[PDB]
Design a protein around this ligand. Structure first.
Ligand SMILES: C[S@@+](CC[C@H](N)C(=O)[O-])C[C@H]1O[C@@H](n2cnc3c(N)ncnc32)[C@H](O)[C@@H]1O
Length: 384
């Protein structure tokens, strides 16, 4: 599994976590989350009612004893060994199709990069990513010719994916806005912010609106939430999410959030779920980002942070989060905040790990918490 991670990043991990933990982290990072979480949209339905609805569809949701809006599904797999060499014609899926097949998705024609020419419908085939990673096995529903030419349709029915997570996007319950798939650490993030109906609230990197809409249901659609993003496409997806979830709480504004103080607002609560190297996301088939990205991104996040701090009222609260493991983007950027008049505060929910040489921040690790790698800091603005 170590091959998925560039050599200098591997050394970085070993240095930062210690060899043993680093090897455990990278090994687990290559796999999908063991517990696949979704958020109950309490704006439209209760947890237990939704459970009832999901059991109807043959799903086995489990309740979180920490998040009353939390449900999770247990992952299946691995369904074959890491060294398994099936005696099968190969279908090569592109980078994106391979990752979904890796988690139980079917393989559709546009997801096909190239294939063995002997493949005819009904043949048992193996599916590999462009770098030879075996991600799944299944039965071809197209001949080679149609497989490499079709623009739509089912190409391989994946009957033996490496791992299996439930597909929820096609459920009636999903279309009706009953839930929003979202990791446990992300749900913790919105809770730890503790939004009030009174608060002036800003989500300055909000799209597609996962944490924003969570705040909305915690507010029970009261108050107002200002949600900022630079990407129009992602904001467009956020608009759809808001409508589907029945969110009436949120004001969308498109802009570079680094210029946030250009508005005249001093917020009581700011969520900064910052763009990051995403070193913690799962599954991690091949990590492309490395050390140069950590430094560059860490510096890029500082602009957001400083923008937030200036836009906070004294006594105001900032919640900073990333889905990355690096020190520089996490504990290091919090030291920055401490030098800028912010103070660390106890988070209302702490089920992850302590930070690196740092006490009140919260880290999540895949091998310890069965989640994506994650980081959460909660700060109080004591002065300007
Ligand atoms: C980690 S994602 C945020 C996800 C969000 N917190 C959620 O729960 O769904 C980072 C987002 O920040 C946005 N972004 C990146 N640079 C930005 C900038 N300079 N100004 C405003 N938004 C930016 C990206 O469009 C991206 O959608």
């Amino acid at each position: 599994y170590l091959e998925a991670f560039p050599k200098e990043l591997r050394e970085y991990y070993k240095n930062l976590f210690g060899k043993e933990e680093a090897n455990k982290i990278m090994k687990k990072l290559r796999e999908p989350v063991e517990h696949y979480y979704i958020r109950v949209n309490t704006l439209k339905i209760s947890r237990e009612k939704l459970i009832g609805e999901l059991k109807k569809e043959g799903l086995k949701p489990l309740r979180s004893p920490y998040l009353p809006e939390g449900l999770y599904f247990v992952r299946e797999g691995p369904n074959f060994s890491d060294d398994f060499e099936p005696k099968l014609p190969v279908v090569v899926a592109n980078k994106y199709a391979a990752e979904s097949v890796y988690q139980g998705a079917m393989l559709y024609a546009p997801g096909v990069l190239k294939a063995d020419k002997n493949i005819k419908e009904g043949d048992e085939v193996q599916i590999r990513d462009p770098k030879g990673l075996l991600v799944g096995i299944g039965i071809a529903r197209m001949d080679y010719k149609e497989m490499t030419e079709a623009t739509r349709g089912l190409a391989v029915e994946v009957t033996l994916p490496k791992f299996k997570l439930p597909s929820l996007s096609e459920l009636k319950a999903f279309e009706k806005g009953y839930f929003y798939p979202q990791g446990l650490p992300s749900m913790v993030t919105a809770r730890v912010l503790e939004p009030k109906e009174d608060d002036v609230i800003i989500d300055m990197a909000a799209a597609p609106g996962g944490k924003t809409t969570h705040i909305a249901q915690l507010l029970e659609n009261k108050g107002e939430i200002i949600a900022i993003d630079k990407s129009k496409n992602r904001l467009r997806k956020m608009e759809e999410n808001i409508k589907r979830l029945g969110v009436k709480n949120v004001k969308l504004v498109q802009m570079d959030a680094r210029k946030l103080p250009d508005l005249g607002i001093k917020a009581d609560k700011i969520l900064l779920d910052a763009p990051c190297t995403a070193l913690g996301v799962r599954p991690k088939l091949w990590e492309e980002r490395t050390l140069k990205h950590i430094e560059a991104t860490a510096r890029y996040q500082r602009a957001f942070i400083w923008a937030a701090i200036k836009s906070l009222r004294r006594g105001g609260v900032l919640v900073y989060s990333t889905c990355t493991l690096s020190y520089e983007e996490n504990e290091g950027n919090v030291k920055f905040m401490i030098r800028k008049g912010m103070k660390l505060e106890e988070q209302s929910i702490f089920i992850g790990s302590p930070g690196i040489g740092m006490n009140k921040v919260q880290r999540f690790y895949p091998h310890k918490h069965l989640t994506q790698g994650f980081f959460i800091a909660k700060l109080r603005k004591v002065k300007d």
